Amino acid sequence: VHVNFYRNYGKTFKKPRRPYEKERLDAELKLVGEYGLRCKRELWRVQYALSRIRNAARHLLTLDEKNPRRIFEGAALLRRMNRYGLLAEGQDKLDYVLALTAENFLARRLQTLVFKAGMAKSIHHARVLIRQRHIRVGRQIVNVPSFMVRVESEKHIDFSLTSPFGGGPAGRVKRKNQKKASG
Amino acid sequence: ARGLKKHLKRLNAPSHWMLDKLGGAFAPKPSSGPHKARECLPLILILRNRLKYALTYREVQSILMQRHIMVDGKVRTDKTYPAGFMDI
Amino acid sequence: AVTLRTRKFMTNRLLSRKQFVLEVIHPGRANVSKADLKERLAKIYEVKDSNCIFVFKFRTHFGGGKSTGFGLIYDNLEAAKKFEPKYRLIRNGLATKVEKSRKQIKERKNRTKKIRGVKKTKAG
Amino acid sequence: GKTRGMGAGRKLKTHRRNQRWADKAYKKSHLGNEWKKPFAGSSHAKGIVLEKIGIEAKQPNSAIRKCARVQLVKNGKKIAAFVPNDGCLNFIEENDEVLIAGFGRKGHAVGDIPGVRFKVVKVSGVSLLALFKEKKEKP
Amino acid sequence: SLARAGKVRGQTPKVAKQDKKKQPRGRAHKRIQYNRRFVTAVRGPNS
RNA sequence: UAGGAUAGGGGCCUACCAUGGUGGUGACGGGUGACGGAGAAUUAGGGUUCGAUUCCGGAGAGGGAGCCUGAGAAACGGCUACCACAUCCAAGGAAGGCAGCAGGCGCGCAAAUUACCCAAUCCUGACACGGGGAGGUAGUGACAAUAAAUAACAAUACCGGGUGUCUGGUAAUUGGAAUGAGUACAAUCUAAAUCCCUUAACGAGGAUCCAUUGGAGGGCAAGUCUGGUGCCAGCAGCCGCGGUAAUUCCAGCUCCAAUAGCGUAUAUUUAAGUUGUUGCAGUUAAAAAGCUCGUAGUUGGACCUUGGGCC
Ligand SMILES: [K+]
Ligand SMILES: [K+]
Ligand SMILES: [Mg+2]
Ligand SMILES: [Mg+2]
Ligand SMILES: [Mg+2]
Ligand SMILES: [Mg+2]
Ligand SMILES: [Mg+2]
Ligand SMILES: [Mg+2]
Ligand SMILES: [Mg+2]
Ligand SMILES: [Mg+2]
Ligand SMILES: [Mg+2]
Ligand SMILES: [Mg+2]
Ligand SMILES: [Mg+2]
Ligand SMILES: [Mg+2]
Ligand SMILES: [Mg+2]
Ligand SMILES: [Mg+2]
Ligand SMILES: [Mg+2]
Ligand SMILES: [Mg+2]
Ligand SMILES: [Mg+2]
Ligand SMILES: [Mg+2]
Ligand SMILES: [Mg+2]
Ligand SMILES: [Mg+2]
Ligand SMILES: [Mg+2]
């Protein structure tokens, strides 16, 4: 026996049924363009996660109100949404979470928040800065642009101490230029 | 098949032994004893996995051989002795 | 500077030691060597010698500036050489490494299991 | 029409069991004849090029399709395999080593080629695509 | 008759590949696609 | 019924007796490219297909049979015999069982190292201590799967939208900064090594540190551009294209889709309300038996506690 065989594993995107449709292609390209993504997979996985959440919520809403197997996970789902900055404080019902959409999720990505916090000149500059180890959430360096930030950590994104943009020594380009100008 | 089995697979262990699935291929088979081997907590799962006294299947022995464990008013050395309910 | 923080501390009287999870905050350096860390642990825990301290299973956190591992402190060196695996004694120079091959030993065992008597050792 | 009694489960089950046989796909799969085909339920096969032939395309088309008569090594059956990608008949020689695959319609003739259900995929351990694009040379 | 196999490909004229700058890859390729189709698109892409 | 045998019940076997036992609610027999299950894929629901493989149960050690020891075996990394292979040999004899690990031949469309270690999980022995191809570790690995680089910004030149200013877009143009792929002290990892994580020093401008796979008539997103061929060569899953002006073949440019993934072949889930219990059909499209009777099956009129509170 190999114990490593017991590790669960799964897939995170689905691909569309009809591959060549003009309106869907333009919609997806529009979203990719101003959300600074890399391919249609980065958006298909967000759609997949949102579909799972919506299916769970719809299954919950089909049950009777006085059913504990509705109350408990309804509270849990609303707690997760209010924790991730998706649902507002004025939407505390299971019906509002059915109205969620993909741009709600894409608005909470670390790249999107870095761009909207004024730290990046553009949403592509934000992704470049994230992947170059210049951004720390709380105290932890993050170099994953898909990092979904929570509300309590929204006030801690800042350039890292090691980063030249957060008080670090000059990079090899600047140091090479100083070496050239030294002699 | 032709006789008794001396091995217990981790996935076949009792549920109340909350054992990490990727911790190994085998679980400690409880020895023959007072309790039914499915409602028992072997000594290996006491000095380990419940107390941090021992870290491996090498220091449970290193402290049983010192005769440091006295279950039900008697020193016991078998690391898979089945302490099963209300045993002191 | 470098700071050390011990968590999940426990005085194991059964094995006569103290075990803890050790966290090193080391900004400005890649890591802290176990040799450079044993003296710090001794100076902050008042251990007369430097051999009863065993630090292992270290790991640097992603991003850097932090490391964690496990540590053990022994009341006596004689108690230390009674409970640890030999390899940890080797790491601190408290034992000697024996150079041997398992397959060679199995070769010899199979070869000499056919001879009966004191002549087994004669087949060298 | 249908038997709607609550006690009529056996009648419905037996009727459906009998009537599944009129299905073309079900009868194809559950008759067991798929094992008597040359591939014997295999995706690909291997063979020896017996000869190089051409077949006139069916009407209203007019062309000569460069096929190849080959013999499978797993059961000895002789089949004709298409050779696509113009100029790829030159790569095939006599008594040569080829890997054959189905043509695409699951045991049905594809295109205007009369009675050809296989296409040559590899020759002498090299793909026809690599030779056609000059990525590889025949050994 | 198999003597005419590989006729047109063998007898076609040969023109070498051109030389050009490499296109952006990954995120930048989608960036330029979005710019070409939404930003500066104020009717065929290969007219 | 009475014994025999077994650890023990029992036609399990023996003597005697009786004629019973199963079957259209499918016995008996045949096929299975059939080990059974937990489960897998696809799933509006119902469903269809698969289930050799790491968990549970069973069976086997080339094929059958018989048995010793032992608490436990009809054991094969135990014996005895026969059949089939096959190994030395001094030709009198002797020894065999990889469906264990690694490896070889063969078969094939189809599957990796004759490596290290008991450090972990556990098991076994007289035993804290030996041993463990169980198990773990490294090697090969685009089976499958996760995250994710291949550039970002400014100026200048050119061109747009809200005479003018701003906004926005392209240039093997000009600048600077940023960084990891790579290399490498070092420490850490590890039973010992290695990978990762961390990090001195070096490391990007055509940032050559050069993205690919399929297509561009329709289905189906993208060319009635240019050159070649001329019902030939070929393309084409289907419809179809090529007979001197080819939007479909052979190539260049341009463009499109997915993108470190894509194409092709088989099997089967959806699509399929084209298997229809949910939920299909039967005048003419395929499909009411020539007609009636008829047992099993399926299906069968109405009628019998309500006031009565309390609660
Ligand atoms: K009996
Ligand atoms: K025994
Ligand atoms: Mg077994
Ligand atoms: Mg009897
Ligand atoms: Mg009799
Ligand atoms: Mg079978
Ligand atoms: Mg099975
Ligand atoms: Mg296997
Ligand atoms: Mg099994
Ligand atoms: Mg057996
Ligand atoms: Mg065999
Ligand atoms: Mg046997
Ligand atoms: Mg064997
Ligand atoms: Mg065996
Ligand atoms: Mg393979
Ligand atoms: Mg073309
Ligand atoms: Mg179109
Ligand atoms: Mg033309
Ligand atoms: Mg119909
Ligand atoms: Mg008619
Ligand atoms: Mg009719
Ligand atoms: Mg009639
Ligand atoms: Mg009635």
List, as one string, the DSSP characters of E1-47: --TTTTHHHHHS--------PPPP-THHHHHHHHIIIIIS----TT-
C62 touching chain A per CB within 8 A: yes
Greatest Cα pair distance, chain D, in angstroms, is: 72
User: Which site among C6, C11, C14, C82 would you substitute to test the B interface, given the most B Cβ atoms closer than 10 Å to its Cβ?
Assistant: C14
Amino acid at site D66: K
Place of tokens 């609303």: A78
Helix-strand-coil split of chain C, %, nearest 5: 30, 30, 40
Burial of A153 (0-12, 13-18, 19+ CB in 10 A): middle
Strands (E), C1-124: 3-12, 17-25, 53-60, 66-74
Query: Is-contact A127 A145, C-beta < 8 A?
Result: yes
Q: Beta strand C17-25 with C3-12: parallel, antiparallel or unpaired?
A: antiparallel
Work out whether the CA dihedral A168, A169, A172, A174 comes out positive or negative.
positive
* Cβ atoms D116, D81 nearer than 8 A: yes
Give residue for tokens 């302490």.
B83
Nearest neighbour of C10 by CB, restricted to B52, B62, B68? B52
Q: Which of E26, E27, E37 comes nearest A29 by C-beta?
A: E37
b/e burial code for range B31-53 (CB count within 10 A of at least 16 → b): eebebebeebbbbbbbbbbeeeb
At CB < 8 Å, which residues of chain B contact C? Answer: 47, 52-55, 58-59, 62-63, 66, 68
The helix or strand, by DSSP H or E, that contains position C89, with its residue range, turns out to be helix C86-91
Dihedrals phi, psi of D6, to nearest 5 degrees: -70, -25
- In Å, what is the CA distance from D34 to each residue of C56, D41, D45, D77, D105? 63, 6, 15, 15, 14
Give bridge partners of residue C25 from the DSSP assignment.
C3, C66
* Interatomic distance B29 CA / F74 C1' (Å): 29
Contact residues, chain C, for B54 at CB < 8 Å: 14-15
Separation CA E21–CA C113 (nearest Å): 74
- For C19-40, b/e burial (b = at least 16 CB within 10 A) is bbebebebeeeeebebeebbee
Which residues, including other chains, have CB under 8 Å from residue C2's CB and lie 6 or more apart? C24, C25, C26, C29, C32, C40
Residue D45: phi and psi, rounded to 5, are: -155, 170
Beta bridge partners of D126: D123
Q: C-alpha distances in angstroms, D40 versus D35, D72, D118?
A: 4, 11, 14
Q: Which residues pair with C74 in a beta bridge?
A: C17
Q: What angle separates helix A22-35 from helix E27-34, to the nearest 10 degrees?
A: 120
Count of C-beta atoms within a 10 Å radius of residue A74: 20
* E-chain residues near A32 (CB < 8 A): 30, 34
Tell me how the structure was determined: cryo-EM
Question: Residues near D67 by Cβ (< 8 Å), separated by ≥ 6?
Answer: D52, D53, D54, D55, D80, D81, D82, D83, D113, D116
Chain A residues with beta carbon closer than 8 angstroms to that of C63? 133, 136, 140-141, 160
Question: Does E26 touch chain D if contact means CB atoms closer than 8 Å?
Answer: no
Give every CB contact of residue D66 below 8 A, 6+ residues apart in sequence: D52, D54, D82, D83, D88, D89, E2, E5
Q: Which chains touch E (3 or more CB pairs under 8 A)?
A: A, D
CA distance A122 to A111: 10
Cβ neighbours for B70, distance < 8 A, ≥ 6 positions apart: B76
**Residue D32 Ramachandran class (φ > 0 left, ψ -120 to 50 alpha, else beta):** left
Measured from the Cβ of residue D16, the count of other Cβ atoms closer than 10 Å reads 9
**Using CA atoms, how far apart are residues A12 and A48, in angstroms rounded to an integer?**
7
Residue D78 backbone phi and psi in degrees, to 5: -105, 125
Contacts with C14 from chain B: Cβ below 8 Å: 47, 53-54, 63, 66, 68
> Residue A88 burial (CB < 10 Å; 0-12/13-18/19+)?
exposed
Other beta carbons within 10 angstroms of residue C95's beta carbon come to 14
To one decimal, the resolution in angstroms is: 2.9
Specify the DSSP element, H or E, that contains D80.
strand D78-82
**β-pair partners for C73:** C18, C53
- Distance between first and last Cα of chain A: 65
Question: Is B21 a known ligand-binding residue?
Answer: no
- The secondary element (H helix, E strand) that includes residue D126 is strand D126-127
Beta bridge partners of A148: A109
Contact assignment for D89 to E8 by CB distance below 8 Å: no
Contacts of residue D32, defined as CB under 8 A and 6 or more positions apart, other chains included, come to: none
Q: Tell which residue, B59, B64, B88, has the closest CA to residue B76.
A: B64
Binary contact (E26, A29; C-beta < 8 A): no
Contacts for A152 with CB less than 8 Å, ≥ 6 apart: A83
